[PDB]
Each structure stands twice: as C-alpha cells, then as structure tokens.
Design a protein around this ligand. Structure first.
Ligand SMILES: [Mg+2]
Lengths: 70, 166, 36, 150, 157, 105, 127, 142, 48, 190, 58, 56, 111, 105, 98
C-alpha cells in the first residue's frame, strides 16, 4: 500500500485537474462564441457593467501586447 | 601455425596444476572455517527445516516468526551442553569452578543457564576462553578431533567443593 | 606518432578522456501575519 | 530462478503445437514449436475438445510461406531455422561503393507554401509534391507545413 | 467419440449486469447446426475487493514468488553417476577412516565370555563421509532391460 | 502447521485482510458484470459466438463481451473417454477377427 | 556504503572498541558484518587470519594464535556506548533458559525407563 | 584492501584448498530501474469521480500482459508498454543456469531429440513410458 | 532394485521417515569423532 | 462494566455545529472491546505534572498519544456501506492503539460476531487478531461477510441521522473526507 | 568474396596484434583468483625452474 | 553419426546377424553363452523399443 | 494553492452530469510509464544548456492541455475514430444496428 | 541511426511511426525503447487533450441554449453559476478573443 | 572490434582449450555437415510423402479440393525450401509436393 497509494493519488489529482481544465476551456470557448454572436448579429449586446469590464480588459491586454512587443 | 587437432577425440584434459579438494584436511590449532557457502548447505538446510522437496514450504510469516520449528524447539527444548570440570571442585574448596561451554554461548547466557536449570544464584563474574577441540590419533594413525569448547571460569560468592570418599 | 589509444594512461590521454575530464506531501499556502 | 515461466508463444490452438518462437517473435534457431501443455494433454482429450472441421482448419498448411510473418518463407522450411537474408539485407553489398543518388520523396502539403526568392509555390494545400529528403526532414516536417505521403 | 458431440457449455462474460436479458431478447434458436438448447445465468459467488485490488494482488504474488523460489532454488539434480563414483572408497580407506579399538576389545571380551554378537559394535560409513555430499533427496533411476543374466535365476551354471 | 496453513488459505481466499484497519468493501459491489451459460449441441467457434451474442450498441471491438469460455461437462468428457477406449478395442478386435479367419476361408 | 554499522569498521571509542566479525540472529533486527558473498569472503578471511591493525598500536580482533570462528560467535545483542560498557539493543537474542516445575506427575518421571559393586579399573566397558 | 599471495605457511596451505570451493550460484535478472513494471498497474485506467479510485476494468484485466518477475513472480501491464520488457521475458524463458552446466544435452542425438531448445530453455519434452509404448503398439497390432 | 547404492549408510528411521536425517547424521559424526565405547587409547597422541 | 452501558460523541462536520451520537454497548458478549471503547470515551487525563516533575522527566507525559477519543476524526467513510474512525496516534487511519497495549485479541468474541442489522458498531482491524481503537459504524443494510473478522460490541441508539449526515460528505482526490469530520468531545452516560 | 582455402596475409596478423595492443586497457583480475595467479611469481626459495613447484608446498 | 547400413541391420534370420560384435572369446562358458544370447536379444529389443518410443 | 482554488470554485452538479453524459472518457495513467532516471541537478542543468535533453533517446516531458493541430497523425486518428463513433451512435439510435444484428441472427439460424 | 534506418523512417512516414512499427527485438536500441516510452506517453496525453476539447465543446453547446439571447445580466449569471464559471475569467477570455479578432483583421 | 578471432584461424574449442568463440550460436539444430547434405534436403530421387492411401481415400482426399483449382496454380518451391509433405491435411493442395 505504501508503494501503490501515491500512484492512485496522482491519478486522482490528474482527474481533478482534467475536470478543471475542461471547465476552463469550456469558459474560453463560451466567451469566444458569445463574442462572435455579438459582433455578428444585431441588437444583441452585453450589459453596461459587462461592456465596461470587457473594454477595460481589452485595454489591459493591448497594453500587455505593446509591452511584450517593445 | 595450427596443430593437428583432427587426431584427438573430443575430451577435455585435466589442467596441469590440479586443484586441491575443497575439504580441509588440516586439524591443527590454526584451522580456518571456510566462509564460502555451497549449494549443498542450502539444500540440506531446506530439507531439514521443511522436508524439501516432499513438503510444501511454509509461508514467509511462519518461516520468519518465532513459531518456526527450529526456533520453537531451540527455545522450549534447549540443547546446550554445559559440563563441569571436576578437576576444579573435586576434593578442593574453590571459589571459581570451571565449566566447558558450547562456543556459541555467552557469559549472560551461561549465568541464566546456571541460575535456571541448576539454581546457582551466586555468580560474580565469568572469564571465557576459546580453545580448539581436543585432537588425537587412534591406533591406525587416523587424526580425530573432538568438538570445540569454551573454558568458562565462574567466580562465586561462597566457596564450593565436591567430596570424594576415600 | 600520436597514438593515444595505444599508449597507456601514463603516456597519453585519449579524446574521450580529455572531453570527459571537463564534464565529469501536502502544501498549504501561508501569508505572513505582518501585512494585511 | 524463474518462479513463473511464460507460456509458449502463440499457443492458441487446440490440437496443433504453436509455430516456432522465432516465427512468432522470439529467439530464432528452432525449426519447430513445442507446447508442454498440449504434449501432456492426452490424445482422447484433444479429440474431444476438437471437431473434424476445426482439426482440418488447424492442420491447414501455408507451405512454403508463414502466416504470422507475411512476405517471407518459413524458418521450419528454410535450411536453417533463422530467417532468410535475401529480402532484409544491408544497404550496400560487400565490395560495393556507395553511389546512391539524391532521391526525391512524395510529401502531402498542409499549407500553401510560397518560395519568395524563386517567386513560386512549393506546393498547394492537400497536394502531393515530390521534394528533397533532407529538405522535407529538416524544414518542412518541423514547421508542420507538410507530412509524408502515405 | 466424434459421433457423440455432446452438449457444450459456453460461458459468456458480459460487460454489464444486464446479462441474459439481451440474450433472451435476441432469442436465437439455431446457429449453423448447433441448435442452442438453453440460456441461463451462471450462478457464482461474488468476488471480494481483494481480487481486484492491486495491493492485495501484489502481496499474493509476492508470497507466490517466495514459495516458488523456495521450491525451485537452488536446483540440484536428483541423481547422477558422479554421486556413486565419488562415494566409493576402498577397504583400506574405509578401515582407516572409521576405526575404533571397540572392535578389538569386543573381540577379546566375546572370546573370554562366550556370548554372541548380532550387530557390529561400531557404525561403518562405507562412503568415508561421501554420502553427506550427495543431496538428501537423491535416489537412483529405474533402468529397463539391463545386460545381465542374474535375473534369470540360474542355479546350475 | 498444516492445519494453520489450510486455515490461512481459506482466510486469504475470502480476502478479509486490509492494511488500513477496516472491513473490506462488499464483494458484489464492484463486480458490474454477469455470466451467461449457453447450452449447445455441437461445437461453435468462439468468434461466431461473440459476433452473434455481442451488443449491437457498443462501439468497441469486444462489443460488451469480456470473454467466452467453451467447456465440456465432466459426464460428457468421461463418456467421450470411455467411447474412445471402446473404439480402440473395437478396431483391435475387428483386425484380430479378420487376421484370424483370413486363413480358414 | 555497508549494511553493518560503522563501528564494526572503526569503533566509536578511540581505542577501537567493537571491532570484529559480528554474527546476528536470523530473527533479529540488527545487522552484522559477517557475509559469505564472493565479494565479502576476502575481508572476512582477512579478519580471521591477518586480523586488524589499529592506528593506536594494537591488534583488535586477532592478535595471534588460534583464529576465531565467526560461524559460532554468540549472536549480536546490541551496540557500544561511551557512557556504559554495552547497550543491549536486542533482548530476544539472549537465551533466557526457563524450565517447567514439579507441577503434575513430574515427580515420577526419570531420565530412563525401567525395562520389563566396588568399581575396578578396566580397559573397556561394552555396555 | 586484502591481497592474495603465496604463503608457504599453514594458513596458505589451508587457503589453497579452501578457495577451491564452488560458491552458491543464482541467475539474477537485469533490474528495471527506468521502466518499473509494477508501476503500470495504474496505467490506462478510468476512475470513478464519486469515490476517486480506479475502476476494476474487466477488459483491462483480460487483455493485460504478464511480465514475469522473481520477487513479485509477474506483473500485469497494459499491452501498449510491453515492448520495453522483451529482454526480461527472454531471461525468464531461459534456463536459470549457465548454459555450460547443461550443455551435455546438445552433445548427443538422444537428448537433442528429447529436449526442447527454444530461447535457451533446456527442458525435457513429453516422453511415453515403455509400458505406454508397448500398449500403443499392441493396440495398433503392429 | 536399490534406490541407493549398496555402500550408502542407512540414515533413516525404522518406519522409513526422514524427519531426523540430519540429527542422525550429526549423531553419527559425533560418535565418529569420539565414540562412547572407546576403551583405553594406546597411541602416543592422546587428547589429554 | 454494567454501570457504563452507553457512550456519546460530538461529531462536527468541518465548521458545523457539533451533533451528538449515542451508542449502546454489549459488555456481556465482549468485555474486552467494550472496556477499551469505554476507557477511550472516558479518557482520564487528570495527571497534572508540576515544574520539578517536568524538569526531572525531561519529557511531558502529554507528548505521547493519550488514550482519548477526543480530537479524533472519521478518516474512512464510504457512502452506502459504513463510516470508520477513531485513530489515536494521528488522524489518518493507520497505526491502531489500545489500552492494553498495541493491539488486543479475543477469538471467542470474534467467532460469535454477526453483522446483520444497520447501525452496528465494530472494531476496524487489519487481521481478526489485531484490534485497536479504530471503530466503524455500519450504514449498509446487511454485511454478512464480516462474521469471523471483526467484533460487534454494540450498536447506535441515537444519532442515525448524524451518521447519514456525515456519510453524505464528499470525498476529495486525496482519499479523505473533503470536510474534516472530527470528534470534539466524547464521554459516557453512566 | 570467397577465401579459396588460402592462408591469411601477414599484415592481417600485424594489424590484429596492433588492435590487441590498443585494446590492452581493461583488466581481468579477480579477488580470490590472485592467490593462484601469484604462482607465476615464484617467490619461495624452494621454487625450481626445472624441477617445478613440488618442494614449495607445505 | 555417419553412414551405417540400417537397411541391413535387422535383416538376418536371427538377432546375431549384422551386429558388429568384436568383444567375444574363442571359448564361451555356459554363463558366457547365456549372456551372449541375452545381449543379442537385448540389443535388438532396445533398438526397437527406443525407436518406437522416440517416434510415438 | 491548487487545493485552495478547488475548494474555492467547486464543480457543479450540472457540469458534472454533462461531463458524465459525454460519450468518450479519458484514461489517466500514462505519466506512470515515463522512463525514470536518477539524474542530479547539476547534470540536468548542464544538459539543459548544452542541448543534451533530446539526444540519445532522451526527452523532456511537460504536461500540456492544448496542442497544435496540423498534421498531427494521432489527433487525426482520434478525430476519425470520434466520427465513426458518432456514426455508430446515429445508427443505433435510428435502429438499423439492431436491424443488421437481427439479419445476422436470422442468417446464422437459416444456415 | 544508419542510412537504411533513415530510409525506413521516410518510408514509414515519421520517426514515431517507425519506432512504433518496430516491436521488441526488431528495435534492439535502448534509445529506441526510451523514445518509444516517451512517444506512448505523449500519444496518451494527446488523446486526453482531445477528450478534454470534446468535453469543453459539449459544455459550451449545453450552456449556450440559455445564454444565447443574453438579454439580462442576472439571467446570464444564473446560468454561469449553475454551470460553475467565473465571471471575471469569462470577461478576460472575451477580451482576449476580441484582441485576437482585432489582430486577425 | 576490428579483428575477430575467426580471422587469425585461432582454434578455440571447448574440448581443446576450454574456450569458445564470441560470435556463434549456443545451440545448432543441424551441424554444417547436415546442412550440406542437399540430397536429403531437396527433392532429389527421394520421396517426400510416405502415406500411400487406398482408392477410396484418394477420392475422399480429392473431394476437399475447391472447384476451380488447377495444378498450374501451385508453383515449384525453390531449392532452399525443404521438400516435405504433411500428408492429407487442410489446404493440402497448396503444397506442391503433396
Ligand atoms: Mg598472524
């Protein structure tokens, strides 16, 4: 048991991290599809605070891109 | 240049320095115990312990526990040949008799032996010496050697003696 | 002339020897109580 | 000491012994396979566990070929129980110089690659183009611009 | 024997616990010339978790390894001609190896008393300690059709 | 030793030992499988049986089948052995009758 | 490294106390330097024949004369210490001889079983 | 460390005869430090998120490949990783003894026909008893 | 036919079991080293 | 120990309020296990050491594991089968301990044990002859495979809802309960 | 590429000896075998070149 | 091994034919003659039985 | 830490039910099949700079969640296998798989 | 490797394909065995990542049915909490997708 | 290794000097003299199928041949292939010698 337990423990941690990565990739793809639907269709936008936070994060990401470029 | 190897039948000759047998023929005072272990030792040990190969081997727990027959018998039915040297306590009141002990026992083991099997409860100290077994030759000249022993001088509190009726 | 593999280690060293001479629980996050 | 000895390789028949271990994938040098279990099994038990159609299917011979290693002869029919060396032999023969030319291998392209110095396309997407071995190995393959045409 | 094909029992281990339900739903009557007789659920005792647990299986395999090692190693042949070759000594060697004054003393005492002796007063090791070199489980093989006229039982030649 | 060894073998067969002190899980809890016994009159190929009894809803090469074990009953096996002995005796006897009466005809 | 402790190689005492070949009980937990491998035979034979010369100027295990027999040495029972003489680490090694008592019919048992005078010097007694 | 020289004394007279003893032999297989075989019992398995432990996959247990071993006697590993244990299988199928000690079976026709020589496994094949041979011949009437 | 050569010593119980084979061998070796019936030794090389 | 027929534990699921579970022991059929359980539920630690005492001992008596069920945990819980706990040397589920010493044994009591009703308390043991402090409350309906292995030294008279509540705790990948199910106070109702 | 039952040239043996002298680096000394290997170094005064190694053994 | 006339071995009217017997004597006693017949029959029977056992 | 993050943001029952209703499930035991080497820190940090990590059959394993998909043969194989799985699921939900199975049954019965 | 081995790699269509086609004693290289273990582990990881992407796609297509109109932020956050998604991380990946779209255009 | 002991004609035999060459087979099923006996290997003046069947057994062995088979389909195996015949077994017509 002292030999075999760490292996199943690592397997359980791998399953937990797999579920976490599934959730994260699903969130990323959900954001992608929502943005695509918004910029494609008409009269389908985000709430006020949502748009404000999205614009702020876009500004931050563009600043980070300019920093890693220069 | 090659040899005429077509004239000999395929048999291996003996080496020129012929090896001596592993059996030790020396029975003197500097007799050496052979550290090299052979297959026959293991075979005889298995056959004596659990009847190899006619009986299945006991599990590792029983083999490594105190209930394995060799250890069980050595504990409950001890086999220690402690014999008294009469030349120390015969017609002389001495405070330190002399015993012949198997070379595997120690001072504390001898004290326990004398205290429990015979009841000698007054033991001050023990001085042990390892002596080679007594060797001799018979009429035909064959060399014999008795089992090795240990001379143990055991100091007591009260002097003891054994009286021989004249 | 220049036979390091034939000569002994006392007379020469090979390219191999010359090259290899140089070569040869649970975690819990804790924050200091000093800061807020 | 071996407390467990692996069974004979490819012993999946009821009446016939397994093929030589060298033919199955073990060591060569043996022109016949032996199975201790099939040998110890009495003849009446084999005839009971087999039927005539199954017996003939197991007797089915592939002489002079081998069913487990396709494209080559069988080591039990070769003079030595080792495989024949006329098919899988070294690249150059004894006393032969190396004069192999530069061969051009087919390669399936994955992107529209355009050489700018020559001003022309290496190959279109999903196009089988014959390119140089070293070029494909060191430049096309690592960039994942193309894969081998198989 | 080939004329009595007899009933064959096919035990099919299904992946799920719905076994024999899918079978009765299929409901085959013949397959080739087999004429399937019946389809039942093979009653068996439930295997404990020890059969599938890797720790328990590793312990059992360790025990089996130790048992087989103790049974197989070290390998010593049951018999060979070298045993009977090495355990042979001459009469002078036997007398020189095992001898005590007991035999002569018993000769004198019996001559003086008049008693009878039925067993030797000393144990004679005819191998001169060579039989201790042969493993204990040794035994000679059975030889068939030997080249000897002794088994005939002749009493006049 | 023999008595205790047979007792310990019986104990190990049931699987009652576990390093972390505690009772093992129940036996029929992790099985998750069943065995169907099919009675045939003639020998059928294992591949045939597997392709005819496999699950049509499983997209796997095994098709819900773990294994197929064909067996002859003990009575049928003893019957086959006795019939083989009788057939050998019959062949020998007919050969002997032919060879004995060949010369008188 | 080695399986046996390092005081068997160089005793913890400045004089070299605890040097030699130490045999251990099979069921004991201590480990000694008595090994019969083809690699350990040289040093075992060296300790048996040549001995061991200490830097203090004394032979610790075998000065001379009759060589010791490590196969019959009493089993190891502990380790040395600077405070006392010897620490008994393994007590199950020491044979505590213990015999039963007269409880029961033990007063009638004799060394021999009964089957259904002035001594003189003789050369031989048969039985 | 300990050197060996001639002697000419009684210690050397004893050593010249004691060093001729044949030490006990045992064929030890090559260890597997890189590819631990008993480490792959947890490889290629599904786990139940309810209890966070592996599932006793019958298909896994059935298709598993057994790599022999001296202290665990064998290990079941997934067949994908079985290619790294091709030499231990050869060492296990081979006789656990130097071939010179048993080579007397390849030096005569009788043993060359009676013994199996496959992966260097000097194991005797099946042999009918003389009574069995006589019985078969007499039943066949030839 | 003998299962052991005619010159082998009989180390076995009366019933045929080999439970005390090694003990019998040790007893025989001890008796060869020093028999209990040994009278007065005449050789000039005596143990004492 | 007829005076002590029932004990109680205060189980806390992480940060929740302690809930009481009351047992009911059978000292007639198995005195040793019941006595051990009662002594562990009691846990008299009234041995108060002084300054000079600590100075001459150099080691506090509290440095060694005390024979108390207090501050223990339920390390082993599987939904639908049982709940196991009661470790002294640590809270991980190994290295049992008893009042008689390391581990006790009682073959005449083990041979007569029968697990056929839920809410039955037994001693969680690795082998039938090595019993310690670790106990388990059976939650499943019938467990007939535990007949000559453990010893059922009583049942639960009050707290089945507590058992079912601590059984529904999710298990984390480490094989332990996600929430630390502990025993904040144990005692005996004489 | 067939021999023709012809002897080998002398340069073959010369190059073989050169390769042997180059690969003369490793050692084959064994511990317990040095006792018998030291017999080539006749150090006892009882050793004889023409008589042998008879009188040196005690 | 090698070439030996197996096609002639066993073709005579009796067992002693086609046997390379070079260990005989000009005078054979009763025991010697009995052993000679025994060895001829034993040679034939051992050859036949060993061949049959190997083949089967 | 990762344990704190997991206790902070747990997995919901709906997401878990979706992940379990997914047809394919992963196998996580491959990290145990990596070759193990007892390599010291100095030696490994020297090889990392001298580009000896991928030489002589060696390699460097780093866990990845997203992978570049272009010409990836194993990814294409898994994609084709998933397409075949979806086709088989469509067949078995339409009922033609049972139709073919019953056809095989009737053929084996008549033959 | 050798020149014939490189030709065989080009024939098989990849170093990984060549190594995996060679089985056991056919590939008698310890370097080959190490690289084969690495390739097998990496293949299993690639299959794991494929399954991961499929799970993510299923989650997205399951949660899109309610978040399609995104008329109310509270209505969106209800589904986000029911499926266990961090709103800040969602906004951050939306911004990353927007920056990527700007870079693409 | 640049020069093998087989080049220098060094006689290394177990019965001669106790040594054996490094590059050789431990077991040899057939020695060089048996391999050179091409008359007993190939089909030269030597029968290969020893079973002589009756007229009814000949006809029964021809019924298992599938319709549409011709003798010209089975080629003569090369010289290095052992000339042998397993008798009347399954797919026996594929054997040129049978
Ligand atoms: Mg000296």
């Amino acid at each position: 048991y002292e030999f075999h337990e760490p292996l199943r423990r690592k397997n359980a941690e791998d399953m937990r991290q797999f579920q976490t990565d599934v959730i994260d990739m699903a969130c990323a793809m959900l954001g992608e599809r929502l943005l695509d639907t918004v910029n494609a269709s008409d009269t389908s936008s985000f709430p006020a605070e949502w748009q404000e936070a999205i614009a702020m994060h876009v500004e931050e990401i563009e600043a980070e891109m300019e920093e890693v470029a220069a | 240049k090659g040899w005429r190897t077509w004239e000999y039948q395929h048999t291996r000759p003996d080496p020129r320095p012929f090896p001596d047998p592993p059996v030790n023929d020396y029975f003197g005072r500097s007799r050496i115990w052979n550290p090299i272990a052979c297959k026959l030792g293991y075979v005889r040990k298995k056959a004596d312990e659990w009847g190899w190969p006619n009986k299945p081997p006991p599990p590792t727990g029983l083999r490594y526990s105190q209930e394995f027959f060799p250890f069980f018998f050595e504990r409950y039915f001890p086999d220690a040949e402690v014999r008294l040297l009469l030349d120390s306590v015969l017609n002389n009141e001495t405070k330190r008799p002399v015993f012949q002990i198997p070379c595997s026992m120690s001072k504390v083991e001898l004290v326990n032996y004398l205290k429990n099997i015979y009841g000698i409860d007054n033991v001050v100290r023990v001085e042990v010496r390892n002596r080679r077994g007594r060797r001799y030759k018979n009429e035909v000249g064959e060399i014999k050697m008795m089992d090795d022993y240990k001379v143990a001088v055991v100091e007591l509190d009260t002097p003891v003696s054994v009286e021989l009726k004249q | 002339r220049f036979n390091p593999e034939s000569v002994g280690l006392t007379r020469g060293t090979s390219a191999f020897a010359w090259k290899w001479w140089h070569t040869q629980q649970e975690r819990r996050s804790h924050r200091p109580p000093a800061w807020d | 000491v071996a407390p467990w000895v692996p069974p004979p390789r490819h012993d999946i028949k009821v009446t016939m012994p397994p093929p030589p271990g060298g033919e199955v994938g073990g060591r060569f040098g043996v022109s016949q396979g032996y199975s201790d279990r099939l040998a110890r099994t009495p003849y009446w038990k084999r005839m009971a566990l087999s039927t005539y159609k199954l017996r003939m299917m197991e007797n089915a011979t592939r002489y002079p070929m081998s069913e487990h290693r396709p494209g080559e002869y069988d080591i039990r029919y070769l003079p030595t129980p080792y495989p024949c060396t006329i098919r899988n032999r070294p690249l150059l023969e004894v006393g032969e110089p190396r004069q192999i030319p530069s061969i051009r291998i087919p390669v399936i392209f994955l992107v529209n690659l355009f050489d700018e110095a020559k001003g022309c396309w290496f190959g279109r997407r999903y196009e089988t183009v014959y390119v140089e071995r070293q070029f494909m190995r060191e430049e096309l393959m690592p960039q994942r611009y193309a894969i081998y045409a198989t | 024997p080939d004329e009595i094909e007899g009933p064959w029992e096919a035990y099919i281990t299904y992946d799920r616990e719905d076994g024999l339900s899918y079978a009765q739903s299929l409901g085959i009557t013949t397959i080739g010339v087999a004429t399937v007789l019946g389809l039942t659920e093979h009653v068996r005792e439930p295997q404990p978790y020890a059969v599938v647990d890797p720790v328990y299986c590793e312990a059992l395999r360790r025990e089996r390894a130790r048992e087989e090692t103790l049974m197989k190693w070290p390998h010593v042949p049951e018999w060979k001609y070298e045993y009977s070759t090495y355990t042979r000594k001459h009469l002078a060697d036997i007398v020189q190896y095992n001898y005590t004054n007991v035999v002569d003393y018993v000769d004198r005492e019996v001559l003086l008393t008049g008693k009878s002796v039925w067993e030797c007063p000393i144990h004679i090791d005819h191998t001169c300690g060579g039989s201790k070199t042969v493993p204990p489980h040794a035994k000679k093989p059975v030889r068939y059709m030997d080249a000897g006229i002794a088994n005939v039982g002749v009493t006049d030649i | 030793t023999a008595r205790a060894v047979e007792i310990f073998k019986e104990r190990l067969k049931r699987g009652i030992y576990r390093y972390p002190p505690g009772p093992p899980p129940p036996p029929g809890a992790h099985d998750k499988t069943s065995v169907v016994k099919v009675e045939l009159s003639c020998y059928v190929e294992e591949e045939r049986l597997r392709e005819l009894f496999g699950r049509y809803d499983v997209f796997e090469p095994h098709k819900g089948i773990v294994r197929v074990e064909l067996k002859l009953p003990d009575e049928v096996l003893k019957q086959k052995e006795e019939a083989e002995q009788l057939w050998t005796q019959y062949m020998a006897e007919c050969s002997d009758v032919k060879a004995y009466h060949q010369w008188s005809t | 490294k080695n399986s046996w402790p390092e005081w068997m190689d160089n005793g913890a005492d400045g004089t070299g106390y605890g040097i030699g070949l130490h045999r251990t009980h099979p069921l004991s937990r201590l480990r000694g330097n008595l090994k019969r491998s083809p690699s350990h035979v040289p040093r075992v034979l060296g300790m048996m024949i040549q001995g061991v010369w200490h830097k203090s100027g004394v032979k610790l295990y075998f000065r001379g004369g009759k060589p010791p027999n490590p196969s019959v040495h009493p089993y190891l029972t502990g380790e040395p210490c600077p405070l006392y003489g010897w620490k008994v680490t393994d007590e199950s090694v020491i044979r505590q001889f213990n015999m039963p008592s007269i409880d029961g019919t033990n007063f009638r048992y004799k060394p021999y079983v009964a089957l259904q005078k002035p001594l003189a010097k003789r050369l031989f007694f048969w039985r | 460390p300990v050197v060996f020289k001639q002697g000419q004394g009684m210690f050397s007279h004893q050593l010249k005869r004691l060093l001729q003893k044949k030490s006990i032999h045992r064929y030890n297989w090559d260890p597997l430090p890189m590819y631990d075989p008993r480490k792959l019992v947890h490889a290629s398995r599904h786990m139940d998120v309810e209890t966070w432990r592996e599932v006793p996959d019958p298909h896994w247990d059935e298709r598993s490949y057994l790599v022999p071993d001296q202290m665990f006697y064998n290990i079941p590993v997934p067949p994908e990783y079985k290619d790294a244990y091709w030499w231990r299988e050869l060492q296990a199928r081979r006789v656990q003894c130097p071939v010179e000690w048993v080579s007397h079976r390849m030096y005569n026709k009788g043993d060359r026909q009676r013994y199996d020589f496959q992966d260097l496994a000097f194991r005797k094949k099946f042999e009918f008893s003389y009574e069995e041979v006589v019985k078969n011949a007499k039943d066949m009437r030839s | 036919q003998r299962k052991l050569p005619k010159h082998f010593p009989v180390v076995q119980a009366s019933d045929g079991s080999s439970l005390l084979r090694e003990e019998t061998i040790a007893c025989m070796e001890r008796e060869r080293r020093l028999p209990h019936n040994m009278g007065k030794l005449y050789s000039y090389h005596r143990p004492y | 120990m007829r005076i002590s027929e029932r004990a109680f534990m205060d189980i806390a699921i992480g940060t929740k309020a302690p809930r009481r579970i009351v047992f009911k022991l059978f000292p007639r059929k198995c005195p040793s296990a019941v006595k051990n359980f009662i002594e562990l539920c009691s846990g008299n630690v009234s041995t108060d050491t002084y300054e000079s005492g600590n100075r001459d001992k150099l080691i506090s008596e509290s440095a060694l594991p005390q024979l108390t069920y207090k501050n223990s945990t339920f390390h082993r819980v599987e939904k639908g089968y049982l709940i196991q706990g009661g470790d002294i040397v640590t809270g991980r589920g190994t290295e049992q301990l008893s009042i008689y010493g390391g581990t006790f044994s009682a073959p005449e009591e083990v041979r007569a044990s029968v697990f056929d009703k839920p809410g039955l308390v037994g001693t969680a043991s690795s082998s039938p002859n090595a019993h310690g402090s670790q106990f388990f409350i059976l939650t499943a309906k019938e467990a007939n495979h535990l007949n000559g292995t453990c010893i059922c030294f009583g049942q639960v008279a009050d707290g089945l809802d507590v058992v079912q509540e601590i059984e529904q705790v999710p298990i984390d990948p480490s094989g332990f309960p996600s929430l630390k199910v502990s025993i904040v106070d144990c005692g005996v109702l004489e | 590429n067939y021999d023709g039952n012809l002897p080998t040239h002398r340069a073959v043996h010369v190059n073989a000896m050169r390769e042997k002298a180059r690969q003369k680096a490793p050692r084959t000394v064994a511990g317990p075998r040095t006792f018998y290997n030291s017999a080539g170094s006749r150090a006892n005064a009882r050793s004889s070149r023409f008589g042998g190694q008879a009188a040196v053994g005690k | 091994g090698g070439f030996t006339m197996k096609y002639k071995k066993g073709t005579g009217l009796w067992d002693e034919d086609h046997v390379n017997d070079y260990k005989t004597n000009r005078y054979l006693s009763a025991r010697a003659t009995m052993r000679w017949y025994q060895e001829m029959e034993r040679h034939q029977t051992r050859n036949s039985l060993n061949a049959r056992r190997a083949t089967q | 830490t990762d344990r704190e993050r997991r206790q902070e943001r747990p997995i919901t029952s709906a997401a878990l039910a979706v992940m379990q209703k997914c047809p394919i499930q992963p196998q996580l035991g491959f990290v145990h099949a990596l070759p193990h080497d007892t390599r010291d820190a100095l030696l490994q940090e020297w090889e990392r700079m001298h580009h000896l990590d991928w030489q002589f059959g060696k390699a460097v394993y780093t866990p990845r969640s997203k992978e570049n998909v272009r010409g990836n043969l194993t990814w294409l194989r898994e994609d084709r296998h998933y397409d075949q799985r979806m086709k088989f699921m469509q067949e078995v939900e339409s009922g033609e798989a049972r139709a073919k199975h019953m056809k095989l049954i009737a053929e084996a019965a008549g033959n | 490797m050798v020149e014939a081995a490189m030709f065989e790699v080009e024939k098989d269509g990849g170093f990984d394909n060549f190594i995996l086609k060679r089985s056991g004693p056919e590939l008698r290289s310890t370097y080959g065995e190490r690289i084969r273990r690495h390739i097998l582990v990496r293949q299993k990881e690639i299959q794991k990542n494929f399954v991961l992407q499929k799970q993510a796609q299923m989650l997205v297509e399951s949660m899109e049915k309610e978040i399609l109109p995104m008329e109310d932020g509270k209505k969106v956050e209800e589904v986000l909490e029911k499926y266990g998604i961090d709103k800040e991380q969602l906004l951050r990946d939306i911004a990353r997708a927007a920056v990527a779209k700007k870079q693409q255009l | 290794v640049k020069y093998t002991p087989m080049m220098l004609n060094i006689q290394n035999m177990m019965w001669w000097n106790g040594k054996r060459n490094l590059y050789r087979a431990t077991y040899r099923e057939k020695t060089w003299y048996e391999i050179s006996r091409t008359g007993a290997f190939t089909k030269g003046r030597r029968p290969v199928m020893r079973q002589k069947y009756s007229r009814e057994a000949l006809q029964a062995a021809l019924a298992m041949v599938p319709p549409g088979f011709e003798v010209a389909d089975v080629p003569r195996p090369p010289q290095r292939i052992l000339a042998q015949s397993e008798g009347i077994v399954g797919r026996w017509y594929s054997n040129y010698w049978t």
